[PDB]
C-alpha cells in the first residue's frame, strides 16, 4: 500500500467504475462536454515546482449530482525529459491515486472520457491532498529524468475545453506507429518480464509488429521504459544470428530467454505457434488454438462465458495455455496482435482463423476487414468467419465452412502424426 | 459393507435408514408432522439413568397391526465425567451413521427428525426393538471409550408423549442453533480445520471459521471444536490466527503452513474472503457452487439439488466435475448453503451485491437470510427481487437484459482478478 | 536416410505426404482394388545375388497409364543373427525405409501393400531396378550388423504373384495363429516399445500377448523379435513376480520396471483395470474408454469417430485428457485388438459393462464382439443390448433403452460413491 493520511476511501474503484447516474458528482465527456486526464512535459520558464492547485469548485463546495469537469494535468520538466516519456509516466497515475474510490480515467490523447463519483467528496479533506500526493510520488519514483513537477485539477468547462483535445488520438497514433513500423525496419527487439510474479518463465519478446500479450506494453513503451530505467524489467536485445526468417528465430533472443526464463525454454519462433511458440503468464487477452478437424485457428477472449467448438471454454484453456510452458498449438495473444502483418505469418495469418466470439468479431470488425482486403481475401472475409451462433461444435461449424468456401479448408493442413 | 452380529429374524440390509418413504405403502410411520419421531443424545445425571437400560416403552413391531402410527424416540441419554452440553450433535450425527448409506428408511432434513417406514416383512418376522437399542449401546460404547459411561434407549409410543418428545426436540434445536449466529470471525483467534474429506480428495484441505461453515455443509466451527475436544488426535486440529499476510483477502502464515503440509504442497497460498484469486479447494461434497460471469459481472449460485442449465452453459454436474477433487480453479467456488448468510461472505469481491443468478428453489429456501443480509448491507429488502432465476433465462443473453432492466448494483462495480490493463 | 543412386525425382522427408489423384495416378500396386503384397522370407546364400533386382515382368518405365502391375516384394537376407521371427519386423521397416523418397506413397502391409507412383517417374525415366537397388541399399543401411547378403526381388508375373501371395497369406495365417496361441497366463515376460517416447518421455505403452499395445500394430511377437534383434532396444522382458492385486493385475516386478525407464513417475499399474493407476497415451492409441457413473459403465470410442458423446465431451477433449503423457484415472487409451482380448478389464466387468460403442466399431468387430459374448455366455444377442449411435446417443436417450434391453452393468456391482 501507499499509507497516506488521505480522506478518499482507499479502494481499487478507479479501474472500471460504471457510476450510477443518481450519484455521480461529475460525469464529464460523454458527447456533452470536454474530458481529459493528462501528464505532459512543459518548458522550464512557464511552470512552478511544487505548486498544487484545484481550479474550480472543490469537492465539498458543490452539491452532488452535477455535470461538471474533472481532470488531472501533471506538467513535468527535466533536463533529459523527452516527448515520448508521457505514455509510460502517465500510467503511474493508476498506481498513485488508484487506491481510492469514485473515479474513471484513462487514455489522454485527443478526445475521450473522464469521470468522478460523489462519496469521495465529503470525507474531510480536499483534492489538494491528492495533488500533493501525486507531486510527491512523481518526485520520488522517477528522480533521474524530472526535476520540476506541477499538478492541477481543473473542474471548469472553459479551461478544460482546450483539454477536450487530449483523450483519444495521441496514444492511438502511438500504437499506430507500431502498426506502420515494419517488423524488420527496427534493429533491436525489446523484452518484457514484469509478469514474472504469476509466471517467472514468461520472457515475452515484444516486437513493433507484435504487442505483448498483456495488451499494454509495446515496443515503443518498452524502449521508453528502458530509457527511463536502464535497470527496469524491459531490457534491450540486439538482433543477431539469424536462423529462419519464415518462423523468425534469432540467436540473441534464444540466449536471453535461456538465461532468463530459467533454462526451461531455449528457442523461440515469433511467426508461428506450432513449433517453439512464445510463453504466457496469465495476462493474455485472447487464446488461440488449433483445430485440425476444422483445419484452422480458434480465438476466444477473456470476456466469453459460453461453449466452444474445441470443447473447452476459455477458463479451462487458461489452465494449460498460461504458466510459462512452450505449448505448440495453443498461445495467448493480445487483441491488437490479430490485426498485425506478422500475426502467425508462417501459419496462414488471418486466413487460418475460423471461429471467434461474435462480440470479438464486432470489436475487431473494421481492422479485420482492412487486413483481409490488404491480403486480397476480400472485404467480406468477416462474414466467412463462423461465430458462436452459427455453431458451437465442430460438426456444426464444418457445414458452414463448406458453404462459405473458407480459405482455411482450401490450403494444406499442419502437424501430422505417427502410427 | 458394514455388518453386525445381532440375533434378530428381521432382514438387515438396504431397508432401515437411508431411502425415501411414501404414505400409501407405509406399514408404520415414525416421524413427520403427523406421528413425529426424533433421536436425542442429551446429558443427565447418573441417578437419572441405569447403565445399559435398553428398554422398549410400548408395543414392539409384531404387537402393532398395520394402521397404527408410533414413533421410535432413540433418547440416548449420556452421563460422563468430562461430557459437556455442546458435544451432543457430534455423537447425534453418528446414531444414523451406522446404517445411513446402507439401510433404507428415511432421515428427512437432518438431526433429530428421522422418518422410519417399518416394513411389513419386519412385522411378520416378529422381532422386538430391544436389540435395536442393544446395537446402539455396544457400538456407542465401542466408538466412545473416553466420554460416555452409561447408554440407554427409551422408545416411547404415546401420542401425547409423542408431542412432548417433539417439544423437547424443538427445545434442543434452538439451543444447538442459536450459538452459531452469535459467533464471529474476529471474536475467536483460533480456527479449526478438517481433513475428513481426504478419502476421495487427499489434496484438499477445508478451513472452518465461526462465520464460514465447511463446504460439506455438515460440520461448523463449533462441531470441529467439539470433535477436537472429543478426539484430540482426530482429523481436525486447531490453528492460531498468527502470521497475518493479507488482511483484506484473508491470508495467514499459519494457515498457509498447515495447507502446505497437508495438501502435499500443491496449495501454498489461500484466500479466505475471495474467489477469483486463490480460492479454497473442495472435496466434491459442496452443497452449492458459485461461478463468476465476466459478461454479467456477477455470481451464479447454483446448488446440487437443482438440476438444469446455468448461464455459464452447463449443469451442476459438469461444474462439480470441473471443480471438486482439490483442483484450485479461480472463478469458481464450492460453498455450503448456510455460508451465503455469513457476514464475511466474499467481502473482498463486494459480497452479496455481486450475485445475479440463483435457481428458484435455492432462492426461495434462502429468502429469509438473503433479505436479512440485504437489509444489513444497505441494499434494501427488495434485493432478492433483482436476482435473476432460471425462469428469467437459462443463457446470458436472456438474463442480461433483465439485469439491466432491474438495475442490478453489480453493474456499477469494477470487475475482478488482478488488474493489468 | 538418403540414397546415392540418381533418380528422376527428389529424395526428401516431405514427399511422404504427397496427394495424388486417380488422374495423376499412373499405375497402382495393391490396395483395395488390386492385389499386391510385401514379403520377407528366410533363405540361404546358395542362390542369392547381391542387389539382383530380378524383375519378372514389364518394368515400371514401359507400362501404359492406368494399368495394373501386381507387385510381390521378396526379400532374401543372409543373417547370422537373423531368425524366421524377424520377418514381420523387417516388413514394417519396408514402410520406414521406402517412404523417405519421392513418389513412394506406400500404405498398409501384408496382402494390402498399396504403392502409388505417378507419371513423374514413368515419364522421367524411373526403372523398377531403381526401386530394387534402393530397397537393397536401405536394408543395408538400416540393418548393417545383421544382414550380410541382400536380394530384393520384385516379382511382377500375375501367375507368380498369385502363387506367391498364397505363401504370403499362409505365413500371415501362421503369424496370427502364433499371436492367438500365446496368453498372458503362460507368458511370463511382456515388452514395451519406446518409439512413442519421441513426444512423451514419461509415457510407456505396455504390450502383452493378450492385451495388445496402444499402438495397435506392435504386438507381443514383433516386440520380442525386435528385442532379439536389438537387445539394447526399448523392449525388455519383465519377470512375472511380486503379484500384489491379481484381481486388477498388479505385479511388483512390473512396477519396478516402470520405475526403471519412466523416471519413477508411476508407482503401481493395474493391467486389468483403468480406474486405479492407469497408463497414459502418446497418441499411438486407437481407441479411448471412459467411465460413466450415470449408467455406471464403460464407453469405448475409436479415433475416427468424433462428435457428441454420453460422457459429455468430444473425442478431442478425451485425447487431451489422456494424451500427452498425462496419467488420469477413470479414462484409458486402448488398442482395437485389446477389445477382443479375454483380459479386457476382467475385474471391471469385461465386455458386460461396455454398452456404448459406435456402429462402425460393431461392424468391424462382428466376428470378435459376438465371439467374446458367446465365450462369456452373453450370447450373440448382446450386440442388440449394445447401445450404438444409430439408436441412442445421449445419456437420456440410452437411459430407458438400457433398462429395456437388460443392461448388465446396473444389474451388477457399481463403482465410485459420494461422501455425504
Ligand atoms: S505481455 Fe505481460 S507477460 Fe508478456 S512481456 Fe508484456 S508484461 Fe511480460
Ligand atoms: S466440509 Fe468436507 S471437505 Fe470441508 S473440511 Fe469438512 S469434511 Fe473436509
Ligand atoms: S503402444 Fe505406443 S507407446 Fe506403447 S510400445 Fe507401441 S508405440 Fe510405444
Ligand atoms: Ni499472465
Ligand atoms: Ni468432504
Ligand atoms: Ni466432496
Ligand atoms: Ni506412440
Ligand atoms: Ni500414443
Numbering used by the authors:
A (entry chain A): 318 to 736
B (entry chain C): 316 to 736
C (entry chain B): 317 to 736
From the article:
CO-dehydrogenase (CODH)–acetyl-coenzyme A synthase (ACS) is an enzyme complex in the reductive acetyl-coenzyme A (acetyl-CoA) pathway that reduces two molecules of CO2 to acetyl-CoA. Finally, the two branches merge through the action of ACS, which catalyses the condensation of CO, the CH3 moiety and CoA to yield acetyl-CoA. ACS binds substrates at cluster A. Cluster A is a [4Fe4S] cluster connected by a cysteine to two Ni atoms that are bridged by two further cysteines. The Ni ion proximal (proximal Ni, Nip) to the [4Fe4S] cluster is the site of catalysis, while the distal Ni ion most probably plays a structural role as its oxidation state is unchanged during catalysis.
Three main species were found in untreated as-isolated CODH–ACS that are denoted wobbly, half-closed and triangle based on the arrangement of the ACS domain. On the wobbly side, the N-terminal ACS domain resembles that of the crystal structure of the open state. The triangle state is an artefact due to the binding of the 6xHis tag to cluster A (Supplementary Discussion). The triangle state was not considered for the ACS conformations as it is not physiologically relevant and is probably an artefact of the interaction of the ACS-6xHis tag with the Nip. The triangle state was not found in the reduced state, which could be due to the reduced affinity of Ni ions to histidine after reduction.
